[PDB]
Amino acid sequence: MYEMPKLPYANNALEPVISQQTIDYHYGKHLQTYVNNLNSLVPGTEYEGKTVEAIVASAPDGAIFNNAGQVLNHTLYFLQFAPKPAKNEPAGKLGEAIKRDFGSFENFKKEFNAASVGLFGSGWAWLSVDKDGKLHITKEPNGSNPVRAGLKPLLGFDVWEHAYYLDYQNRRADHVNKLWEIIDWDVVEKRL
Amino acid sequence: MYEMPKLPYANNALEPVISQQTIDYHYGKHLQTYVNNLNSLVPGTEYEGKTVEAIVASAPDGAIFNNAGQVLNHTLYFLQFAPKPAKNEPAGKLGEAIKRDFGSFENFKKEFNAASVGLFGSGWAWLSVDKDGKLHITKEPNGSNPVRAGLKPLLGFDVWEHAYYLDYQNRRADHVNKLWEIIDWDVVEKRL
Ligand SMILES: [Fe+3]
Ligand SMILES: [Fe+3]
Numbered sequence: 001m002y003e004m005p006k007l008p009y010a011n012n013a014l015e016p017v018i019s020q021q022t023i024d025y026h027y028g029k030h031l032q033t034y035v036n037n038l039n040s041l042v043p044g045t046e047y048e049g050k051t052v053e054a055i056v057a058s059a060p061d062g063a064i065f066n067n068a069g070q071v072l073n074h075t076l077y078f079l080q081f082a083p084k085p086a087k088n089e090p091a092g093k094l095g096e097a098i099k100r101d102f103g104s105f106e107n108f109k110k111e112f113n114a115a116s117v118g119l120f121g122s123g124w125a126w127l128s129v130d131k132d133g134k135l136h137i138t139k140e141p142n143g144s145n146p147v148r149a150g151l152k153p154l155l156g157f158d159v160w161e162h163a164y165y166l167d168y169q170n171r172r173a174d175h176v177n178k179l180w181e182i183i184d185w186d187v188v189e190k191r192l
Numbered sequence: 193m194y195e196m197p198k199l200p201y202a203n204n205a206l207e208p209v210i211s212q213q214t215i216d217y218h219y220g221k222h223l224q225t226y227v228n229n230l231n232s233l234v235p236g237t238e239y240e241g242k243t244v245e246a247i248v249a250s251a252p253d254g255a256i257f258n259n260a261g262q263v264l265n266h267t268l269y270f271l272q273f274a275p276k277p278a279k280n281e282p283a284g285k286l287g288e289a290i291k292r293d294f295g296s297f298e299n300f301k302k303e304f305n306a307a308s309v310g311l312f313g314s315g316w317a318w319l320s321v322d323k324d325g326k327l328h329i330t331k332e333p334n335g336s337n338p339v340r341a342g343l344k345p346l347l348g349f350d351v352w353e354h355a356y357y358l359d360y361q362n363r364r365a366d367h368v369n370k371l372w373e374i375i376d377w378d379v380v381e382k383r384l
Contacts, residue, residue, distance in 0.1 A: 029362045066312045120258045121334040122313035122353075142313035160313075161353035162362065170221045170354065 002038050002052065004031065005075045013083040017178045019167050027078060030162055034070040041067060056147040069143035073124055076191075077156050082184035094154070094189045101135040109180065115139055116157045116176045127155040129192055154191045155183065194230045194244060196223065197267045205275040209370045211359050222354055223266040229259040248339045261335030265316055269348050274376035282377045286346070286384050293327040301372065307331055308349045308368045319347040321384060346383045347375070 007027065012020035041064050042048045047055050052075070055068035089105045090098060102108035108127075115137050116125040124140040128151035135154075138146055146153045157179060164175035199219060204212035230247075233256050234240055239247050244267070247260035281297045282290060294300035300319075307329050308317040316332040320343035327346075330338055338345045349368060356367035 025361050033362065063312070120255075121315075161357060165353060165357040166361075169217050169358075170225070 001042075001049070002035050002071060004035055005079060007078055009081070009083050014081060014182055017182050018081075022164070022166050025166065026158075026162055027074075031071070031074045031078075034067050034074065038064070038067040038071055053147055056145050057150075066143040069140075069145045069148075072145050072147065072153075073140075073143065073156055073158065076153055077158055080155060080184055080187050081182045082187075083182070085182065085184050085186075087185050088180065088183075090185045090189055092189055094185075094192055097129070097133065097135050097192075112137060112155075112157070113173070113176055116159055117173045119159050122160045125157045125159060126151075126153050128153050152191065155188050193234070193241070194227050194263065196227055197271065199270055201273070201275055206273055206374050209374045210273075214355070214358050217358070218350075218354060219266070219270060223263070223270075226259050226262040226266065230256070230263055233259060245339055248337050249342075258335040261332075261337045261340075264337050264339065264345075265332075265335065265348055265350065268345055269350055272347060272376055272379055273374045274379075275374070277374065277376050277378075279377055280373060280375070282381055284381055286377075286381045289321070289325065289327050289384070303329055304347075304349070305365070305368050308351050309365045311351050314352045317349045317351060318343075318345050320345050344383070347380050 007023075011023040011027070014023060038052070042050075045064065047059065047064055047068075050058075052068045052072045055064060056072050059065040059068065089095070095105070098105055098108050102111060112125060112127060119125060119139045119141075122142050123144065126136075126138045126140055126146045128136050128138060128146040130136060130151055136146075136151060138149070138151070140146065145156075157176060159172060159176070164172060168175040199215075203215040203219070206215065230244070234242075234247070237256070239251065239256055239260075242250070244260050244263045247256060248264045251257040251260060281287065287297070290297050290300050294303060304317060304319060311317060311331045311333075314334050315336065318330045318332055318338045320328050320330060320338040322328060322343055328338075328343060330341075330343070332338065337348075349371060351364060351368070356364060360367040
């Protein structure tokens with residue numbers, strides 16, 4: 001019932017920022033496994049027939065949450081990138097909210113990089129919006145996603161080692177610095 | 193105060209099970225960073241003058257515990273391996289305790305592999321002994337180590353992706369299966 005999300009670009013199209021090798025493993029093996037696992041774990045449970053978002057919003061810690069969170073996180077992650085983005089910062093309401101909540105986009109980038117690099121272990125740095133329009137940076141452990149806390153996820157950096165280890169090894173910060181160049185802000189803006 | 197532990201073998205000596213590349217990054221970069229961080233974080237705190245082990249036993253969750261736990265974990269990890277072990281299973285008191293508590297060494301291996309593969313995200317599978325001589329398998333998240341719970345750690349498998357990603361990518365189970373052939377049971381026995 002859960003299917004792989006189609007990439008809007010070729011597996012090597014994010015080069016030189018993310019290698020084809022990383023996309024091949026990260027999308028083709030890790031995300032495939034999360035989808036496979038979710039399909040294996042939901043039969044016989046009331047989570048069968050639920051969207052990944054509904055599961056992430058409701059399930060306690062466990063294998064189903066872990067895999068549904070990872071399916072949601074990776075879907076949002078791969079689909080927020082483009083080979084050659086038209087713009088390299090957000091405009092519109094998101095641009096305005098970033099100014100309001102972080103002072104400037106440049107300062108948001110600093111804070112978001114810091115959260116990404118500071119997360120100990122596996123997880124995700126997320127920029128989300130709450131139901132009243134305020135932005136939040138969160139460190140989501142392991143497979144967690146801000147939907148659990150009732151936030152709407154906008155931009156997610158995967159800092160599981162598999163996201164970067166083939167390209168950057170231990171140098172997480174060097175990886176995170178490069179991601180800005182491939183963010184499709186048109187997609188991110190429309191998550192508000 | 194905190195120094196890198198001397199490796200008892202050359203960086204390529206665990207080949208073909210663990211590559212030189214993995215030792216170069218895992219020991220030379222990851223463990224170096226954890227030791228560096230502990231040296232940066234501990235001066236001027238209640239932890240100054242304490243051994244790594246004492247810190248792991250006493251510190252609450254936070255950056256000091258994360259780094260001290262990882263120093264302890266990795267120290268025990270590297271020192272429990274040898275290029276060409278004389279035997280491939282424990283004898284003596286350890287051998288007897290494994291039979292007692294797990295039925296056989298083969299069943300211990302099955303349970304330990306299962307704990308290793310089942311740990312979601314970053315962490316460690318640990319075999320430890322309690323005050324009564326009973327053995328336990330624990331899944332320690334992130335930088336945790338059984339010393340916190342007053343258990344004495346005997347054998348630890350690192351299932352952070354950096355431990356295996358360069359050699360096995362996503363195939364953690366295939367990595368864990370190979371570790372058994374480089375365990376130095378002479379060292380592990382003397383931990384009991
Ligand atoms: Fe990932
Ligand atoms: Fe490690």
